[PDB]
C-alpha cells in the first residue's frame, strides 16, 4: 500500500512496517519532474537534460538547466526548482570550503558524502521537510571520473548510468542496453550521441522540447566541465533524429 494513513502527516515517523512516508511522497514528487540523465564514459561524464520550450521573452543565455557547482563538477536535478537551487548552493559552498582548506579540488566521493549527509539531516525532525529533488552529479578528480545520484532520503550511489524524471524507465532501459553493448568502454563523443538519442527517445508524450548536453572529460575538456558548442550539439541532434526515424 502506497498510501499509509495515520503515519504520513509528519516527517520523522516510522510506519508499522518501518517506512517513512514523507520521503516516499518526496520521491513521488521527484518522479513527476523533468527527465535528466547522466552517462559515465571512459574518462569523463556526460549530462543530458530535456528542456521544455517556453515563451520567447526569455533571454536564451540566462536560463540554463544544467548547473555547475565547481570547475570539475557538473550537476542536474529533477523535482522542485527551489530545492534544487538550495542544494546547488550548498554544494558550491562545500566545494569552495574544501578547496580553501586543503588547496585541492574536492574529490567527488567526499562531495557526494557531504551532500548526502546534508540531505539526510532533513529527515530527522518534524519541523523540516525532505528535499523534493533527486540529483545526478559527477565530475573528474585524480582518481578518475565519478558519477553519483542522490535521493530525497539522503541515500546516494555511484552509477555507470543514471536517469530521473517522468521518462526514467525508458531512459534506464536504454542505458542498460548501452552498457550491454559497450562492456569494455565508451568514448566521450559516443556518450554525447547516445545521451542525445536517449533524451529524444524519452519524450513519447505532443510537446516540443530542446536538449542540453554537458561534457566533463580529460581528453576533451581537460578535466573541466563545459557545455556543448554548436557543431557537436547539431550533430547529436541530427543523430538522435536519424535514430528516431
Amino acid at each position: 500500500t502506497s498510501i499509509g494513513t495515520g503515519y504520513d502527516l509528519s516527517n520523522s515517523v516510522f510506519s508499522p512496517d518501518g517506512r517513512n512516508f514523507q520521503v516516499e511522497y518526496a520521491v513521488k514528487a521527484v518522479e513527476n519532474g523533468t527527465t535528466s540523465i547522466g552517462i559515465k564514459c571512459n574518462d569523463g561524464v556526460v549530462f543530458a537534460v530535456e528542456k521544455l520550450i517556453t515563451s520567447k521573452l526569455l533571454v536564451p543565455q540566462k536560463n540554463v538547466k544544467i548547473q555547475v557547482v565547481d570547475r570539475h563538477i557538473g550537476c542536474v536535478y529533477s523535482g522542485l526548482i527551489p530545492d534544487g537551487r538550495h542544494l546547488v548552493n550548498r554544494g558550491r559552498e562545500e566545494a569552495a570550503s574544501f578547496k580553501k582548506l586543503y588547496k585541492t579540488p574536492i574529490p567527488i566521493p567526499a562531495f557526494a558524502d557531504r551532500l548526502g549527509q546534508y540531505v539526510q539531516a532533513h529527515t530527522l525532525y518534524n519541523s523540516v521537510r525532505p528535499f523534493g529533488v533527486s540529483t545526478i552529479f559527477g565530475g573528474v578528480d585524480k582518481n578518475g571520473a565519478h558519477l553519483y545520484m542522490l535521493e530525497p532520503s539522503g541515500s546516494y550511489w555511484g552509477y555507470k548510468g543514471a536517469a530521473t524524471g517522468k521518462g526514467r524507465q525508458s531512459a534506464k532501459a536504454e542505458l542498460e542496453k548501452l552498457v550491454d553493448h559497450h562492456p569494455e568502454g565508451l568514448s566521450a563523443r559516443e556518450a554525447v550521441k547516445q545521451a542525445a538519442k536517449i533524451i529524444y527517445l524519452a519524450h513519447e508524450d505532443e510537446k516540443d522540447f530542446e536538449l542540453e548536453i554537458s561534457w566533463c572529460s580529460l581528453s576533451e575538456t581537460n578535466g573541466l566541465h563545459k557545455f556543448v558548442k554548436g557543431d557537436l550539439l547539431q550533430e547529436a541532434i541530427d543523430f538522435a533524429q536519424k535514430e528516431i526515424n
Binding site: 550548498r90 559552498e93 569552495a96 570550503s97 525532525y125 519541523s127 523540516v128
Partner: protein, 254 residues
C-alpha cells in the same frame, strides 16, 4: 535549523558585521540607531576603559578638547510665586564670532529650566534627553510631570554612569500646582538636593551673603528680580528668568 545551517556556512567576520549593533550603528539595515529612546554609548573593548579615557582626555589641539562650561556665577531662589534664576552673560575669548548670546541656561520645556555648571556636551545632551522623557511622561499620564520626578530621573541616569567620566551639575527649577515652586540640584556623582536658595560658580559666597542680607518669603516679582540682579553684580550683563505656574519668562537685563 535553517539559521543553524547558515551559521556554519561560508569576510563579514573581519568587518564585524555579523553583529546587530555594528550594522545598526553604521546605518546599514536602516535608521534604527536614531530611534533608540535610551542611547547606546561606545566603550573601548579593553580591561581599563575609564583609565584609558582619563589618560586620553588630558593630552593637545585646543579645538579637539572637550569643551567645559565656564564656572560663571549662577543663582536661583524661590520667593513667593516663582523662581528667579540669574546668570552672568560674560563671554569668553575664542576663535569664533557669536550670532547670539551664549546659551548658559538650557530650556528643558516651556515650564522647566536647567543650568550647565559642568561639561557643555553632557549637560546639553542629557537635558534634551530629560525633556524628551518628561514629554513622554506627560503624554502618558495626561498631566505635567512633577519637578521631583524629573530631578529623580536625571539623578538615576547620571548615577548609572557614575565614575565613567561624566561631569555635570544642574539646577532643575519648576513650578507645579501640587508642589509649588521647587529647586533641585543634581550632580554627576548622583547627588540630589532640594533647596530654597542655590548659588554656584567661581564666586558665590558674596552672592549668598547678599541674598541672606535681603531675602524673605514676602517679596514681589520686581523686588526679586532686582535682588537677583544685585546679587549677580555683587558676585562680579545679568540674564534673568522668572518661573511661574504658567512657565518661564526671560529678561535680558530687566
Amino acid at each position: 535549523m535553517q539559521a543553524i545551517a547558515d551559521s556554519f556556512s561560508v569576510l563579514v567576520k573581519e568587518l564585524q558585521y555579523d553583529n546587530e549593533q555594528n550594522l545598526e550603528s553604521d546605518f546599514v539595515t536602516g535608521a534604527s540607531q536614531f530611534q533608540r529612546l535610551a542611547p547606546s554609548l561606545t566603550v573601548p573593548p579593553i580591561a581599563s576603559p575609564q583609565q584609558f579615557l582619563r589618560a586620553h582626555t588630558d593630552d593637545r589641539n585646543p579645538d579637539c578638547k572637550i569643551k567645559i562650561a565656564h564656572g560663571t556665577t549662577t543663582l536661583a531662589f524661590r520667593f513667593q510665586g516663582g523662581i528667579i534664576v540669574a546668570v552672568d552673560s560674560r563671554a569668553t575669548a575664542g576663535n569664533w564670532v557669536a550670532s547670539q548670546t551664549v546659551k548658559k541656561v538650557i530650556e528643558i520645556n516651556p515650564f522647566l529650566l536647567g543650568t550647565m555648571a559642568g561639561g557643555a556636551a553632557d549637560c546639553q545632551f542629557w537635558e534634551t534627553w530629560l525633556g524628551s522623557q518628561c514629554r513622554l511622561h506627560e503624554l502618558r499620564e495626561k498631566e505635567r510631570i512633577s519637578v521631583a520626578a524629573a530631578s529623580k530621573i536625571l539623578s538615576n541616569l547620571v548615577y548609572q554612569y557614575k565614575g565613567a567620566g561624566l561631569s555635570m551639575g544642574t539646577m532643575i527649577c519648576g513650578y507645579t500646582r501640587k508642589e509649588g515652586p521647587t529647586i533641585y540640584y543634581v550632580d554627576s556623582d548622583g547627588t540630589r538636593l532640594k533647596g530654597d536658595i542655590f548659588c554656584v560658580g567661581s564666586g558665590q559666597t558674596f552672592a549668598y551673603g547678599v541674598l541672606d542680607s535681603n531675602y524673605k518669603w514676602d517679596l514681589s516679582v520686581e523686588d526679586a528680580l532686582y535682588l537677583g540682579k544685585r546679587s549677580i553684580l555683587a558676585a562680579a550683563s545679568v540674564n534673568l528668568y522668572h518661573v511661574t505656574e504658567d512657565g518661564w519668562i526671560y529678561h535680558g537685563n530687566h
